[PDB]
Amino acid sequence: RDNIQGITKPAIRRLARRGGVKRISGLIYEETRGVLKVFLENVIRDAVTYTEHAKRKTVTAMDVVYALKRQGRTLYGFGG
């Protein structure tokens, strides 16, 4: 598959602009892609564990909320 490139250069540029950055290096995109991939992999692993425990086939949004809560990234707006 290898669709990690879905997070394209303009997306990372907008994410940086929102963060106060006004000038980005060329090698920043391949590093941001890997960082985001690791963060995802972790959160999705936690969510898939929570889902398998519940004997459910669908990864509910509350499972993602709990997975983020484990990493300290408490996300309000989806149930908790």
Added chain:
Amino acid sequence: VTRIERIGAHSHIRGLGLDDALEPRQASQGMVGQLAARRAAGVVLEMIREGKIAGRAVLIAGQPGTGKTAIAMGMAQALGPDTPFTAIAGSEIFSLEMSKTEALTQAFRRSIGVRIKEETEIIEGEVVEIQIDRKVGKLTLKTTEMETIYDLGTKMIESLTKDKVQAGDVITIDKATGKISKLGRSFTKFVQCPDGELQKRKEVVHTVSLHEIDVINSRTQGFLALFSGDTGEIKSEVREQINAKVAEWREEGKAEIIPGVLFIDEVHMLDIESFSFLNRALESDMAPVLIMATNRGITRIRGTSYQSPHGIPIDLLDRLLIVSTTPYSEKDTKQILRIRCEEEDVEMSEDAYTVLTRIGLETSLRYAIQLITAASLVCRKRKGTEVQVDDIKRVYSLFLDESRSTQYMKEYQDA
């Protein structure tokens, strides 16, 4: 799962079961009984490892099936690698592309190894970048501990342009020749990068036999031994000077010879012309200590109506040592059957063991060893776990033997 080599007829044999004083144990290393012949095998093996008194022949006589080949396989296993053990049947010398005498001397040479030491330097790392300026360039190699650049000379740039090797490939570079070899693309074919130093001196030793040297020094790219394209090397012109040059390598510090071992099975197939050649080929310095076996007694010699022991002329019979093997008893046969079962995954009962030992003492030993696996599989047919007496009886009924099949010939067939 299953390798090219499987459970053959001599797998249980792991070597000679002798002590430090060449005293055979009752049963060890897969060799049961056969005390006298096994210790004689030990003596010949010791005098072979010595490698001073060359040009000796031994003949393992005995009744058919009395471990005559088992002793040879055990000697081969005990001698271990790094020592040529050439095993050929008496029928293999009869060749159309070469004369029997030439094939025999070829086997002799094959049964003699030459030890040579090398001090080449081998590189082992991973490619980081390859450059080409149409010509000179630079090469950067990487290992888990260091990285370095390299100036791509004519030979290096040419070889790396001919080969598709590129950045990110664990490779080896013999600075002597420059042979490039890639063991796997990358991190995970793929394989990790090497460790330690990038360039390190490595000693290499090659136990090349006189046969290999002769074939290497006979023609332009004369290394055609892989298919034996050669019909016979030039005796006394390219075969005697190689001996002198090897002797020059010796007594100087360049090379040392390793006495091999030859095992001609079923020597009674050799004709009188082959025996005549052995009478003189076993009197030279570069002659291996060979062993042989024959199940026949005083039979006819292939070539004339003369009768002689082993079908071998008297002139050669008085030139070798005979090693007779005695017939096995109930104990030895039962222990051999047990070792054979241990070699495989079969596990027979005690009563089954007794029945199989009786069946193997009635007709012959090899018949029981063959029925072992048949009964093992018939047990798995009834969905059992242990080979009982009933399975062995069913097999004995299904599969016949030599003596019982010959007696069933009460109906005349073709002739």
Added chain:
Amino acid sequence: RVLDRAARQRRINRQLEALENDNFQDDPHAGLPNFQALLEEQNLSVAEGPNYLTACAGPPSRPQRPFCAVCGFPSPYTCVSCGARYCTVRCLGTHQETRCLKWTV
């Protein structure tokens, strides 16, 4: 990263210049308390023909020896930072911790 070739050449030149600094190679203080000019006296109007300019030997025919920069032994390797050759991994480490893109000697 990797250093350019200008930096390596400047390092080589400055080291060769230090190799002829006779007064004091590192710190020429050692106490502060007809005055002709320096070698400039002729280095400013270098003549032609037989002179210290044309008297140079030139490039040799024997290729440079690949000797280590740390211990002074043969060095089949070359550091990517500044090209300084090294013999073993220990040499590369002792170099990187003493000479690198940041330090010269």
Added chain:
DNA sequence: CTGGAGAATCCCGGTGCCGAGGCCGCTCAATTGGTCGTAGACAGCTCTAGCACCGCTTAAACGCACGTACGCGCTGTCCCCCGCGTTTTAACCGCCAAGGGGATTACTCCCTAGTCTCCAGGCACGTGTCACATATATACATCCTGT
């Protein structure tokens, strides 16, 4: 440092779209009323630390003096990101079959687990030694002195 354009915002008024709010109607869950064992609070009692010193010893913090080495600014110039216009492309559709994949609800039932015993053995506590650290006779062992 102004002009002089020139885009970009950005007031400001306009207008339907649709979420926000509200109202209705039950369901369920918090209240009521009352009984019933604990929780823990409080009144002693014990004795363990905690605190408070004091003295002797000396490591250590410390100030000073004194270079060297590293920090900062400057400079040059030279690569590599920005701004912006063009070709590419993927992301939205829309299409055209015919039905299920799976959370959600629900009802038996039944193994599993609480509760609550009585015990007895296995783990906190007291005591017996043994490995490393300490302080001291000692048999020579090196200057000093009669000689």
Added chain:
DNA sequence: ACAGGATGTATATATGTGACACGTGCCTGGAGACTAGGGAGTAATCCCCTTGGCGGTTAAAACGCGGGGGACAGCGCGTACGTGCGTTTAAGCGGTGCTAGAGCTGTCTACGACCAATTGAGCGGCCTCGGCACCGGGATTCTCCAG
């Protein structure tokens, strides 16, 4: 020059901490017999989707290019921080030597916990319609030469 005393000094032996291993007793697990309730295990409902292949269309990417203005290194140089050092300050390593104040034990209530009623929040289900979200200007307000 020597024969013997007058001091050192590692060397070998009996005495101080610690930490493991052992040995009793008393709490905490284990063992057993009842009694739910919880959860498993089908069996039904309601979602609203489901996939392949493929045609179409618009903007978000994707790419080209110029070029500018920043990212790097070199140069220099002037503080400034580490490096000894001589001083002195005060930690700390053992002591003594009280007293709060943990830690406990016991006692005995108020305080929860059910619990069976009772019932009114509160939750979903519709309806409605102001309120944000976007159009359309029209001023304004930065940005960028260009002088």
